[PDB]
Design a protein around this ligand. Structure first.
Ligand SMILES: Nc1ncnc2c1ncn2[C@@H]1O[C@H](COP(=O)(O)OP(=O)(O)OP(=O)(O)O)[C@@H](O)[C@H]1O
Ligand SMILES: [Ca+2]
Ligand SMILES: [Ca+2]
Ligand SMILES: [Ca+2]
Ligand SMILES: [Ca+2]
Ligand SMILES: [Ca+2]
Length: 903
DNA sequence: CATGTATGCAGTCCGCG
DNA sequence: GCGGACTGCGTAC
């Protein structure tokens, strides 16, 4: 097999590399790496090395990495560019793996772990590690085993061995419901003292050294706690055995009352699953507890136990260990669904970076571009210092706030990357400039053609048409991957709807789910077989289709994020290729493109409808247009349609056969106007939206920029079995909006869009009458706890203190002296509730860590003093008032002359 | 060490015979 | 008490 790296580190003048050899064996080596850097040289000097602007360079070969870094400083002092890759491990990887990396994940040791620590005096601080580690579960991907380390004897209590028999039993039978599919994979190791537990864990660690280290909050809790606990008991060099190269770095971040630390373990790649989740999931959660996320991702119930966690080991050691095991497994389950570890490996090896550098799009792109240029013996430019400077972004149309009955939307495929490729925007493709006219002159096609030789953007930049740029070249490669995966995702989505349609008429029979590849549209023969399947088989197939869709979403959305990230990086001062000429060439082109095509669509639709001067495009944002299709439907007459699907079909066909070609002609003309390298402005239909035929539904509404709702029947070619709401920006989509309020607001929207005003009014009345009966957590607001200390003036709110921070301070006073109540952690999220005047907390609101019940001591008072009136008004009524006034209808029946009568 | 800008709403402060 | 500056937060791209 071809060799591939596992980890790489620079330690002084050595590169330390863990890798897989040609036989598939894990090996480690130390290499006294001799790096090269480059200096500009005279033309008369023959060389095979050129910088990106074709200027000759001489190679400087250094005897070591320190000599290389010292030369960099001398060059800076002299005032001359020091060219080449200054991150030497990237150079090392590029030299060592001078080919496309094909990696085998089954050879990569991925470790998932979690520890337990009983603490009778508050949260167990990792930097202090003053309490015994009393459980570790460590899952090893190569063994496929859960190694469980259980402390029987502790100063906080002596307990009996954990029982796997009881663990496997249902909870309803007093067991723990440890999932049956992992029971046989548990290797249980009880210990009579912590020292033996820890020494054995380290010995185990040495035999099975993680390459990828993950788990839930491992970076901020488990890793630093294990490190510091070992340090305190055995000494720092024992703790260093956690690094295969015996080198660590301690980062002491100043939390101020108290403090915490992050440990860097050289030769391990730590990918804390919480960080993977936040970067790759594109959700924004009100809570990041593992229980909350697991419930959200997997629909498994919260792990229940009685009393505080500090008393769980002594009262119920059986459950304590089981829950430690299950927590480790839950992360694996989330990953089996989301596939973020796979994504990370994919991207890391593609870029040739340390795997943990997938968190940094700038590092990822620096590596990709470096490797690409190095292949052509080209020499990368030195990174330079730049002041931060704001620059212009996208255009967003101001919508007239209203209900909009029929709407069709269109947007550009991968807009900014497509612009990069169309215009050929790269650091080395800049050809010069032209004199800009006002943007509106380009939009209206009245400005002078910028160039008839070069490819242009209305920001004034010109690029070579007849040569490749590394940015376009490399961005295209990742786009093409993105496109492949999005294809798989949409096919799985379409396939899911076929199964949903078939579930209407299930067969009474005993059968099997069909062995199909969900990444591809079902053939007619498969469709026929599906129409004869039972409910059971259909539901399993639907589960599989949706898992395939999710896997496709992960793969495509994060490749989309990476290429969009390159466009953004050009405007980040730390990017080697930072250049506001290139950043604004993209955004200014996007502004022109949107407004150009708005003009063209208004022109086309006026012509085909036989009118003049009517505004068809009601809204747009960055690269999208929203077309009111009322006149299209009215031209044929609503009466002609058999059902909703009939008009949906009609608009679908109208968009594809009439509008899209007109849009394409419009953009081709724009491409010719800017004399661009390649026409790539592909604006495909997104949504077809409207009310159900014959209903009083309003179809859709806008309240303003970035705030709207649509009743969608077809999305990017997926014809839904049931209409689906597309809601953007409204409170239903915000993690700060109480959960039960998101639900009620969405139902209010659904009723508005599908049923009409009377239906809405009926629901509002019910919700207002039942509001006070909702669980307090379901109606609490959510906020992020930032700069708490800033506004903390002797436990009381300072000036300009935000509402949620005031809530936190109220909480800190209420829990004072009590050692057992959970602390609000800086940066994390809190539930927030308003409080009626005269309450025993002495302020207008209270806040507590999200995803939890509020501590028992004050729960009763909070419940008694919650201000329901304020809560209903602020979270529910006020937003609903915004929706309804925009849509020109009422959530409460207005008084009228008819009130004089008895109906 | 190191993706971007555009943008609405809820909050505090402050003015207001 | 209401509404205009000014800003934090969360979101749409
Ligand atoms: N997270 C982001 N970072 C930087 N720029 C972004 C981001 N999201 C959107 N943009 C910019 O807005 C443009 C349009 O966004 P949009 O969500 O339509 O995605 P897209 O790249 O056009 O891909 P798609 O083909 O899915 O529409 C992007 O091309 C860019
Ligand atoms: Ca735990
Ligand atoms: Ca788009
Ligand atoms: Ca059937
Ligand atoms: Ca878009
Ligand atoms: Ca599309």
């Amino acid at each position: 097999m071809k060799e591939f790296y596992l980890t790489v580190e620079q330690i002084g003048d050595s590169i330390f590399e863990r890798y897989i050899d040609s036989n598939g064996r894990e090996r480690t080596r130390e290499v006294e790496y001799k790096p090269s850097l480059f200096a500009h040289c005279p033309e008369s000097q023959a060389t095979k090395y050129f910088d990106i602007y074709g200027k000759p360079c001489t190679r400087k070969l250094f005897a070591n990495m320190r000599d290389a870094s010292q030369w960099i400083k001398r060059m800076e002092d002299i005032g001359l560019e020091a060219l080449g890759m200054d991150d030497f491990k990237l150079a090392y990887l590029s030299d060592t793996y001078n080919y496309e990396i094909k990696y085998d994940h089954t050879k990569i040791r991925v470790a998932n772990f979690d520890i337990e620590v009983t603490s009778p005096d508050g949260f167990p601080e990792p930097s202090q590690a003053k309490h015994p580690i009393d459980a570790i579960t460590h899952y090893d991907s190569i063994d496929d085993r859960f190694y469980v380390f259980d402390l029987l004897n502790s100063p906080y209590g002596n307990v009996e061995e954990w029982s796997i028999e009881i663990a496997a039993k249902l909870q309803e039978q007093g067991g723990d419901e440890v999932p049956s599919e992992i029971i046989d994979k548990i290797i249980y190791m009880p210990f009579d003292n912590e020292k033996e537990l820890l020494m054995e864990y380290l010995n185990f660690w040495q035999q099975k050294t993680p390459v990828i280290l993950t788990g839930w909050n491992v970076e901020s809790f488990a890793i630093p706690y294990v490190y510091n606990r070992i340090k305190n008991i055995f000494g720092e060099s024992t703790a260093k055995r956690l690094s295969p190269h015996r080198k660590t770095r301690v980062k002491v971040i100043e939390n101020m009352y108290g403090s915490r630390e992050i440990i860097t373990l050289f030769g391990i790649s730590v990918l804390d699953y919480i960080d993977l989740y936040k970067k790759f999931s594109f959700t924004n959660q009100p809570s990041y507890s593992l229980d909350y996320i697991s419930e959200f991702e997997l629909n498994v119930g919260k792990l229940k136990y009685d009393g505080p966690i500090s008393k769980l080991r002594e009262s119920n050691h059986q459950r304590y260990i089981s829950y430690n095991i299950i927590a480790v497994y839950r992360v694996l389950q989330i990953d089996a669904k989301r596939q973020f570890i796979n994504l990370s490996l994919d991207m890391g090896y593609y870029a040739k970076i340390q795997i943990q550098s997938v968190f940094s799009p700038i590092k990822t792109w620096d590596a990709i571009i470096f490797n690409s240029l190095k292949e052509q013996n080209k020499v990368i430019p030195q990174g330079r210092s730049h002041p931060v400077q704001p620059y212009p972004g996208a255009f967003v149309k101001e919508p007239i706030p209203n209900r909009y009955k029929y709407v069709m939307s269109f947007d550009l495929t991968s807009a900014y990357p497509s612009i990069i490729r169309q215009v050929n925007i790269s650091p080395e493709t800049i050809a010069g400039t032209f004199k800009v006219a006002p943007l509106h002159d380009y939009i209206n096609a009245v400005a002078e053609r910028p160039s008839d030789v070069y490819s242009c953007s209305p920001n004034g930049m010109m690029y070579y048409k007849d040569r490749d740029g590394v940015v376009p070249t490399e961005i295209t490669k990742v786009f093409n991957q993105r496109k492949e995966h999005k294809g798989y995702m949409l096919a799985a989505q379409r396939n899911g709807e076929i199964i949903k349609e078939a579930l209407h008429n299930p067969n009474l029979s005993v059968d099997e789910p069909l062995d199909v590849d969900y990444r591809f549209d079902f053939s007619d023969e498969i469709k026929e077989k599906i129409k004869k399947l039972s409910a059971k088989s259909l539901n399993e197939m639907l589960f599989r289709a949706q898992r395939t869709e999710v896997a496709g979403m992960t793969a495509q959305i994060n490749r989309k994020a990476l290429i969009n990230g390159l466009a953004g990086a050009l405007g980040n001062v730390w990017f080697r290729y930072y250049d506001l000429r290139n950043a604004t060439a993209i955004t200014t082109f996007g502004q022109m493109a949107l407004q150009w095509i708005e003009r063209k669509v208004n022109e086309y639709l006026n012509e085909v409808c036989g009118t003049e001067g009517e505004a068809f495009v009601l809204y747009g944002d960055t690269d999208s247009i929203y077309v009111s299709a009322d006149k299209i439907i009215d031209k044929v007459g609503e009466s002609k349609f058999r059902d909703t699907n009939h008009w949906v079909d009609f608009l679908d066909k109208f968009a594809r056969e009439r509008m899209e070609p007109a849009i394409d002609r419009g953009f081709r003309e724009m491409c010719e106007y800017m004399n661009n390298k390649q026409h790539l402005m592909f604006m495909d239909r997104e949504a077809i939206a409207g009310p159900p035929l014959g209903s009083k539904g309003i179809g859709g509404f806008w309240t303003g920029k970035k705030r709207y709702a649509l009743n969608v029947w077809d999305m990017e070619g997926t014809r839904y079995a049931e209409p689906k709401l597309k809601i953007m920006g409204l409170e239903t989509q915000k993690s700060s909006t109480p959960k039960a309020v998101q639900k009620a607001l969405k139902e209010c929207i659904r009723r508005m869009l599908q049923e009409g005003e009377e239906s809405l009014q009926e629901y509002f009345k019910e919700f207002e009458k039942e509001f006070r009966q909702l669980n307090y957590i379901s109606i609490a607001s959510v906020s992020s706890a930032n700069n708490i200390a800033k506004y903390d003036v002797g436990g009381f709110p300072g000036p300009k203190c935000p509402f949620h921070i005031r809530g936190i301070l109220t909480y800190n006073r209420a829990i004072k002296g009590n050692i057992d109540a959970p602390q609000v952690v800086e940066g994390e999220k809190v539930y927030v509730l308003p409080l009626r005047e005269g309450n025993p907390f002495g302020d207008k609101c209270i806040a507590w860590p999200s995803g939890t019940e509020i501590t028992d001591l004050i729960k009763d008072d909070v419940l008694h003093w919650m201000d329901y009136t304020v809560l209903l008004e602020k979270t529910f009524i006020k937003p609903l008032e915004g929706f309804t006034s925009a849509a020109k209808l009422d959530y409460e029946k207005k008084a009228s002359l008819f009130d004089m009568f008895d109906f």
